[PDB]
């Protein structure tokens, strides 16, 4: 337990030496981007030893490193729950970040402050490993809020760009709406269980956890960009592509799904929470896929792909399938990260052009990227025996053979076909048509800092799901018995989605003009949710902030009632009693009244 504990603790120390170096004079002498990349690599390799020991023993740990403070009868300790989820996620996350760190040295080679960019990515990784291995809600919240800040600084990397700053504040606003949920759950457990530690929270399995579980579902909704709080994910694509690959697809966005996997022992006895995850998730997968079908920016298509796969993980949790929802996160990190890297390779080689309408014929000019770009698409669309088949296939097998919402089942299968339709959109327009980019061609992709990190993911996109699926313990009983059409249902719709896409995308070659329709306008304009909610809601609130609060109350009626009326009253009196005519005749006449009043007063008291 010393070697397991020491390696677990040692991962954090390795990732903190780049942070320490960045704060000394050494950073100006070494190749800091390479130093961080080597540092994270060794961290990943060490992260395999705790991983193997768990594959052998399946034995989880609870390591309390530090005692922070006691609040009477409630101690807060830095403690790590090195169980199944944090052991495996830690390795997948450190493996992806080894690719993105090395990718960045090639992608950001012009940015003068490149080694601040490296430092921030390291800080995000640390606040993501804090989140995933936390043993108590408070230490969850450090990572929960920490990745929230680290997202803000990286989405707003180009702080002179006004749309980056608006997208960064937009990410913060939605994630603070989900902080309410997290804080709601935290107060509830400290009041009804006297603890924030996951061990003590377990003995709440027989309470009625509606209030805490609603809080966690709202926090998960905001953090994973589920319907209602979803705009911030496609908007986060302002930041540099290495940020999009690392945070907003393969780590930060799975925090909400990861959270509800931690608390699965409670959500298994709540049908209201399960049914909400099943319907909230189903809506997310369909709605974002419909959006992705007619986008033109390459990243927003990929970003909208994530929202849809995130919703599907949510649908999984409504089946009470926590270990499938997690296995999807671990599988989805590989190819999705690669798609951003393969897409981010094109963007760099075409003068930072991202509209797929100005891309074409990439399967020839960029062979390597296109090849990895098609492995990623097929892994994503659940082709057999790729990383994404050992997760997606089981989920589609489960969604069919469970008692569930008929409409959630129906739209979730449609959204699984649309995953092939919009992937085909990229394969088609990006790799298959004729060139549409400008005529000066300076496409280079021979850099090892580009090919090597993409290759690592490419191997992960092929073999990783297989290895993961065969080494984890048996979790739940799969319903392996079903008619022949429920057992191939995923494949047929995915094949059908491709076939439907080919016909549709091959009418664009016809010399017939394309016209607007309400259905494509809805798809292209994100269902109008941003165009309304981001205009009406901030107007009414900011209009109240000024007209009601500042002006009507503080500046006006709170002045008028207290300080102003008090000064008016006393100025009124000092005016009445001071304007005397200076005539002794009148003074004595008042002295005469005074004397009579004293005589009268004394008279009626005899």
């Amino acid at each position: 337990m010393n070697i397991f504990t020491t390696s677990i603790l040692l991962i954090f120390i390795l990732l903190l030496s780049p942070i320490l170096i960045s704060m000394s004079n050494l950073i100006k002498h070494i190749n800091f981007p390479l130093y961080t990349t080597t540092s994270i690599k060794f961290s990943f390799i060490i992260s395999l030893l705790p991983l193997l020991m768990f594959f052998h023993n399946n034995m989880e740990y609870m390591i309390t490193t530090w005692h922070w403070v006691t609040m009477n009868s409630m101690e807060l300790k830095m403690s790590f729950k090195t169980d199944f989820f944090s052991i495996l996620f830690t390795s997948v996350a450190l493996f992806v970040t080894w690719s993105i760190m090395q990718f960045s040295s090639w992608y950001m080679h012009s940015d003068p402050n490149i080694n601040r960019f490296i430092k921030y990515l390291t800080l995000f990784l640390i606040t993501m490993l804090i989140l995933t291995s936390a043993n108590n809600m408070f230490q969850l919240f450090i990572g929960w809020e920490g990745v929230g800040i680290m997202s803000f600084l990286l989405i707003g990397w180009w702080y002179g760009r006004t749309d980056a700053n608006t997208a960064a504040l937009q990410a913060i606003l939605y994630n603070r709406i989900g902080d309410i949920g997290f804080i709601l759950a935290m107060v509830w457990f400290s009041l009804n269980m006297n603890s924030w530690e996951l061990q003590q929270i377990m003995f709440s399995n027989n309470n009625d956890n509606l209030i805490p579980l609603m809080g966690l579902l709202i926090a998960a909704t905001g953090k994973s960009a589920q319907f209602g709080l979803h705009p911030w994910l496609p908007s986060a694509m302002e930041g540099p592509t290495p940020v999009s690959a690392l945070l907003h697809s393969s780590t930060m966005v799975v925090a909400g799904i990861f959270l509800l996997v931690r608390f699965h022992p409670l959500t298994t006895n709540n049908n209201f929470i399960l049914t909400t995850m099943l319907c909230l998730g189903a809506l997310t997968t369909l709605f974002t896929a419909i959006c992705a079908l007619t986008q033109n920016d390459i990243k927003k298509i990929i970003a909208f792909s994530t929202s849809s796969q995130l919703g599907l993980m949510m649908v999984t949790l409504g089946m009470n399938q926590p270990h499938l929802a997690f296995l999807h996160i671990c599988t989805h990190a590989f190819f999705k990260a690669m798609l951003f890297m393969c897409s981010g390779s094109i963007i760099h080689s075409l003068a930072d052009e991202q509209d797929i309408r100005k891309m074409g014929n990439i399967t020839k000019i960029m062979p390597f990227t296109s090849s990895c770009l098609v492995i990623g698409s097929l892994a994503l669309t659940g082709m057999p025996f790729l990383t994404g088949f050992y997760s997606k296939d089981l989920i589609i097998e489960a969604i069919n053979t469970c008692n569930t919402n008929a409409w959630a089942l129906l739209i979730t299968l449609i959204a699984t076909s649309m995953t092939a339709m919009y992937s085909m959109r990229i394969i088609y327009f990006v790799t298959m048509t004729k060139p549409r980019f400008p005529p000066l061609i300076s496409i280079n992709e021979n850099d090892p800092d580009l090919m090597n990190p993409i290759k690592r993911l490419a191997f992960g996109s092929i073999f990783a799901g297989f290895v993961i699926s065969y080494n984890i313990p048996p979790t739940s009983i799969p319903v392996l018995t079903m008619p022949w059409f429920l057992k191939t249902t995923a494949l047929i719709i995915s094949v059908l989605g491709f076939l439907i896409a080919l016909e549709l995308n091959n009418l664009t070659m016809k010399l017939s003009m394309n016209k607007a329709n309400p259905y494509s306008s809805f798809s292209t304009l994100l269902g109008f949710f941003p165009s309304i909610i981001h205009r009406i809601t901030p107007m009414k609130s900011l209009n109240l902030s000024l007209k009601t609060s500042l002006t009507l109350l503080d500046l006006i009626w709170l002045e008028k009632t207290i300080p102003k009326s008090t000064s008016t009253l006393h100025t009124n009196m000092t005016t009445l009693t001071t304007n005397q005519k200076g005539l002794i005749k009148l003074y004595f006449m008042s002295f005469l009244i005074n004397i009579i009043l004293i005589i009268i007063l004394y008279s009626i008291n005899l």
Partner: protein, 177 residues
């Protein structure tokens, strides 16, 4: 960006501007270059057609009708150049455009590393000061007796004279610092 706008667009400017907008949106729908070329020639047919209609009271009614037709057949998401307003690279490097005056606070030990850049810079600061007086004088001499004014500026009409108000244009930071 370089040219200040006029007081009002003429009919000729409002129709050319529409023509360019309507082609860029066509290219957004068509995508494919052969398909974009075909319909771009049809578009020109619709603008050559009423090219000569010189009524000047139905030419307008042919423009408001055509703008109301453009606004209905917009692409909901037109293509934008990455550096253009609304583009993905728009203002990306504005955080790297430090004004030249920030060098006037540099420490000497910093200025000691670029002795020859910092020597070709005191020449420019001299040239700026000697020229200033003559620049202000020229701008009054051309202040039209009628208040009617335009944002444009006059050139140097003489020898040894730089055009008035030239420092914030000549010294502006590079587009890609």
């Amino acid at each position: 960006a370089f040219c200040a706008p006029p007081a009002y667009l003429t009919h000729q400017q409002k129709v050319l501007r529409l023509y360019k907008r309507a082609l860029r949106h066509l290219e957004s729908w068509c995508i494919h270059r052969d398909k974009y070329r075909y319909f771009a020639c049809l578009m020109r047919a619709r603008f050559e057609e009423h090219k000569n209609e010189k009524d000047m009271m139905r030419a307008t009614q042919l423009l408001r009708e055509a703008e109301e037709e453009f606004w209905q057949n917009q692409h909901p998401q037109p293509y934008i150049f990455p550096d253009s307003p609304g583009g993905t690279s728009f203002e990306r490097y504005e955080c790297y455009k430090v004004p030249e005056w920030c060098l006037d606070y540099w420490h000497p030990s910093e200025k000691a590393m670029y002795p020859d850049y910092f020597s070709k810079r005191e020449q420019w600061k001299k040239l700026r000061m000697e020229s200033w007086d003559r620049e202000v004088k020229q701008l009054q001499e051309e202040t039209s007796p009628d208040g009617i004014m335009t944002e444009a500026l006059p050139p140097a009409r003489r020898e040894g004279d730089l055009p008035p108000l030239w420092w914030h244009i000549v010294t502006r930071p590079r587009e890609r610092p």
